[PDB]
């Protein structure tokens, strides 16, 4: 062991962030393409970087979904926090959603095309929310690129998804300040 | 805005103050208790990640014990309270450093010095990382050195005031 000044031994500790699972979201990374932000012991949210689309239309009927009020209220907050943190978002047709039956299905079309890409804004937000192990997802003044064509956000089940990085709440809690920042008037 | 959540953990101790991270809060480790002189710095410092985590775990402990659990997990409370627990500009700093290739704090691993006979402990400081690689101890050895110095200075300030 490391001894400094003869009498002080260097020691370490690692926080088990899963103790916070009942009060705040927990982000973690399963592999390069699959990332998760979990809420509690039952539900959560899978963030996918993929070439395989799941929505071929260009609708995001949030007004309908709100009125019907079948979705998980916490998950919808996270979706809103995610989308409201995207800098300079202006291609509403690059964002497709399906909320039938209360599910969460959100698809950002990253292929709508460096810094002025809508993918830039989306990926930056994805970088910040999966902060723990997002460095293996992708590789210029913060501006990012990816060969993947879609970012998909779908609700998932509580399983052992955190196979590459351990759960952390920092990514979500630090994104909260980016909401309604660098947002355009419409 | 500026954090305000106070840590309350004085029961049964030799002197009020400090904070004990239970086994549940630590990855594969037994309980770790930090004394008042270290933890009391969390009331003043504006840039110690570990202090933000102390308030975070204490809020989680308090909220679970003092509020009744909802049927479906709500994150309303943490959204309401986050800025009284952590300094969102502190992790902005860690984010900007990451963006810049500078070693940064991912809030998971901390180091501290521990006196080999009196057990006195320093306030844990975040073990930095960059592109998935954690710094080696050699990368910040002189930091550990000055920490040992502050420990020695404090131990001498205590023997003086213990008269």
């Amino acid at each position, epitope marked *: 062991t490391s001894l400094y000044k003869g009498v002080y031994e260097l020691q370490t500790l690692e926080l088990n962030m899963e103790t916070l699972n009942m009060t705040m979201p927990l982000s973690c990374t*399963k592999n390069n393409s699959h990332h998760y932000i979990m809420v509690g012991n039952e539900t959560g949210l899978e963030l996918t970087l993929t070439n395989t689309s799941i929505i071929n239309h260009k609708f995001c009927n949030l007004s309908d979904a709100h009125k019907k009020n079948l979705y998980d209220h916490a998950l919808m907050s996270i979706i809103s926090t995610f989308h409201l943190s995207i800098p300079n978002f202006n291609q509403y047709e690059a964002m497709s959603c399906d909320f039938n039956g209360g599910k969460i299905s959100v698809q950002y079309n990253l292929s709508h095309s460096h810094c002025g890409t809508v993918a830039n804004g989306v990926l930056q937000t994805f970088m910040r929310m999966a902060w723990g192990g997002s460095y293996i997802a992708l590789d210029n003044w913060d501006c990012i690129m990816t060969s993947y064509q879609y970012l998909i956000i779908q609700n998932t*089940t509580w399983e*052992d998804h955190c196979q590459f990085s351990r759960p952390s709440p920092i990514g979500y809690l630090c994104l909260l300040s980016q909401r309604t920042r660098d947002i355009y008037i419409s | 805005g500026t954090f305000t959540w106070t840590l309350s953990d004085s029961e049964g101790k030799d002197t009020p103050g400090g904070y004990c991270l239970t086994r549940w809060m630590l990855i594969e480790a037994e309980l770790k208790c930090f004394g008042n002189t270290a933890v009391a710095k969390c009331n003043e410092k504006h840039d110690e990640e570990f202090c933000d985590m102390l308030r975070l775990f204490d809020f989680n402990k308090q909220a679970i014990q003092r509020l009744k659990a909802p049927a479906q997990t709500s994150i309303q409370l943490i959204n309401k309270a986050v800025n009284a627990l952590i300094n969102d500009q502190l992790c902005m700093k860690n984010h900007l450093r990451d963006i810049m290739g500078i070693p940064y704090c991912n809030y998971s691993k901390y180091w501290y010095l521990n006196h080999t006979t009196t057990g006195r402990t320093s306030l844990p400081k975040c073990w930095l990382v960059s592109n998935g690689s954690y710094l080696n101890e050699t990368h910040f050895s002189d930091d550990i050195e000055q920490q040992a110095d502050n420990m020695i200075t404090e131990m001498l300030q205590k023997e003086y005031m213990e008269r």
Partner: antibody
Amino acid sequence: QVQLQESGAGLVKPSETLSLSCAVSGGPFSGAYWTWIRQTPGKGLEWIGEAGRSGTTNYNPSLKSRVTISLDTSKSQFSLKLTSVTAADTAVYFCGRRQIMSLSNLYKRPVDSWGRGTPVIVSS
Amino acid sequence: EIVLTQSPGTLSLSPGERATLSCRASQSVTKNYLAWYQQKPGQAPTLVIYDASTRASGIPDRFIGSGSGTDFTLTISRLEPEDFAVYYCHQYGSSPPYTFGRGTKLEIKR
């Protein structure tokens, strides 16, 4: 409170494929590793494999890549498929539910709920 | 595989006595992830001990799990009639595959 019930052809001619299924009821089809375990009277209990909804699937090396455990989340039923069946694959086959306790498997728990078991015989 | 050797093969005792069942592991069992199962004939196995020493739901104080590393032990004191079955040793802390012991049959001595 969960209940596992297994079903399928208990009769398999050699050099064919055994196909069994496990119906999960009285609980969500989530948060667990769905496990197959068989018990021969001579050689004891042998762990066959595990399939978790997280995507992880690991088998017993002794089964030499002739075993497959699929999940089918819609019908709430995981399945066991054993190809190239031999005389030694005759046994009682059991359903399993290994509850998952951590997002990172920081803590683990063994299989706690087992099916009734279906006798399976291999003969011409 | 971590082979679990269980001794004895058969243990003959009468109600009220004490049963000491042994399970030795080839390799050290990770995080004491060692479990005990009770199988009565024709029935499926029943969990009675996990984490080497923790009792499961509805398992009376008679059952006591005791062990660490490669040396594990299940002791059933004040033996009741319902306790006689074949008890199995299971480790779940390794990489694939999880293994079982070959069993210890607890029969009644008349």
